């Protein structure tokens, strides 16, 4: 994509924010139409701005657009928590197709932070019949998109079989993730307690289980 946008953009609650969108003179905004897409990654996107500053029907006038001789801009007044997602711009003509840009992640801060919900689960009896063991560490309802998970067998670090997911936005405008630990029945029997530690940027939630209980 020669259509270059802003790198990464943050913001505050109830303020304005500006997003860029430009490219070379071949895909320039001098004589081409520009459109904007609100793109929730993995869900239904939305057209918000079409062909110029004119917005799609139903769009609140909080959004606006501008087209210079070398770049296009997207302006958002009164930032809301649901505006915290990645946006894209497209350049096109009447006959040509869409040309997407690089992308611009949007993060509206100044909101109420969320205390996380971390729960640890052991494998059940049916997995003991399967001769495997999987620790389940579920993470939800945390505001900043950054978590670090550590697995400790008898409070001793584990490096093999350690898998941790990526932060995912909860539909309630929070975030969610998870992390698993695969172990053998020999390593499941030869320990006292298992610990999943999730170090928050302002706290740390640890859950401890045991094969004997």
């Amino acid at each position: 994509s020669v259509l270059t946008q802003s790198a990464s953009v943050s913001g505050s609650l109830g303020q304005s924010v500006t997003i860029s969108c430009t490219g070379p003179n071949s895909v320039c905004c001098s004589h081409k139409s520009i459109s904007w897409y609100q793109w929730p990654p993995g869900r239904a996107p939305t057209l918000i701005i079409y062909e110029d500053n004119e917005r799609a029907p139903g769009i609140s006038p909080r959004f606006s657009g501008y087209k210079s001789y070398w770049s296009a801009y997207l302006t958002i007044s009164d930032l809301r928590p649901e505006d915290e997602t990645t946006y894209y711009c497209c350049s096109y003509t009447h006959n040509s197709g869409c040309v997407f840009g690089t992308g611009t992640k949007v993060s509206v801060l100044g909101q109420s932070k969320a205390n996380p919900s971390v729960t640890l689960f052991p494998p059940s009896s049916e997995e003991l019949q399967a001769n495997k063991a999987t620790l389940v560490c579920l993470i939800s309802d945390f505001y900043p998109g950054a978590v670090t998970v550590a697995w400790k067998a008898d409070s001793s670090p584990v490096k093999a079989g350690v898998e941790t997911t990526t932060p995912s936005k909860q539909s309630n405008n929070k975030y969610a993730a998870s992390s698993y630990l695969s172990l053998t029945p020999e390593q499941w029997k030869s320990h006292r307690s298992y610990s999943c530690q999730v170090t928050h940027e302002g706290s740390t939630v640890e859950k401890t289980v045991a094969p004997t209980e």
């Binding site: 994509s1 139409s33 459109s35 793109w39 990654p41 993995g42 869900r43 239904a44 996107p45 939305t46 057209l47 079409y50 062909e51 799609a56 894209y88 497209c90 096109y92 003509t93 009447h94 006959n95 040509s96 197709g97 869409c98 040309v99 997407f100 690089t102 992308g103 729960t119 689960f121 494998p123 059940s124 049916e126 997995e127 399967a130 999987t134 389940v136 579920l138 939800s140 079989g161 898998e163 997911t165 995912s168 909860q170 969610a176 993730a177 998870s178 992390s179 698993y180 695969s182």
Partner: protein, 240 residues
């Protein structure tokens, strides 16, 4: 009122082919272009192409000029303003870079400078190009956990573990429970396994008046697991 529906999730091998449907309703199928755009984590989203069910004019990206074939049926008029058409898309020469969620959408206007622009998007269809095998899940119940000792709220769910193909949707008591239903995303193991969880926050007094059954429906493997979560708790903050 256009409520479009795409196809279901399917699993294929590299070098093979897969066909995705795009069934429409509530609007005139021949009045709008039908766009097709993918979302792959390797190169972000990429516009694949649009088509005109009326004039029969399609337009693809030059990178998809050889491997993408888009077809449309003729619209089935329900009323004088409603029709139920269909738009299929076949993609061949599957590679590792063609893994992601695909979309079909309705054209913007019937005349003007931006006519084909996608307005009403479908729910999406996720595709995973893999040489691996389809493996069913292993579904476990979850023990109740205390959430508020003074309030009296328990948290119970179900655990879907170790499935290679496409993800799974889960209902609760045959879809009769939607309040408190919170579903977690999948994992990525070193072997390529996916596993997630789901949970619901139930009242602690709701143990002799209601029954909670989770329903797992893995479609690419064509399996179903109906589990009953035991109301017997194990958290010391909830036993009191």
């Amino acid at each position: 009122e256009g409520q479009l529906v795409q196809s279901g999730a399917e699993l294929k091998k590299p070098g093979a082919s897969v066909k995705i449907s795009c069934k429409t309703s509530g609007y005139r199928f021949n009045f709008y272009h039908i766009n097709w755009i993918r979302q792959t984590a390797g190169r972000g989203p990429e516009w694949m192409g649009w088509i005109s069910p009326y004039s029969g004019d399609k337009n693809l990206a030059p990178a998809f000029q050889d491997r993408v074939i888009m077809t449309t049926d003729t619209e089935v008029p329900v009323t004088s303003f409603t029709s139920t058409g269909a738009a299929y898309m076949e993609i061949r020469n599957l590679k590792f870079d063609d893994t992601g969620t695909y979309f079909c959408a309705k054209g913007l206007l019937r005349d003007g400078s931006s006519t084909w622009l996608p307005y009403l998007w479908g729910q999406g269809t996720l595709l995973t190009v893999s040489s691996a095998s389809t493996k069913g899940p292993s579904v476990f119940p979850l023990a109740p956990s205390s959430k508020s000792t003074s309030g009296g709220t328990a948290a119970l769910g179900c655990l879907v573990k170790d499935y290679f193909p496409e993800p799974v949707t889960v209902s609760w008591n045959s879809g009769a429970l939607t309040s408190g239903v919170h579903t977690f995303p999948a994992v990525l193991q070193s072997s390529g396994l996916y596993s997630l969880s789901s949970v619901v926050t139930v009242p602690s007094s709701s143990l002799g008046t209601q029954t909670y059954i989770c329903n797992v429906n893995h479609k690419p493997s064509n399996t179903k697991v109906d589990k009953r979560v035991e109301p017997k708790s194990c958290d010391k903050g909830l036993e009191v």
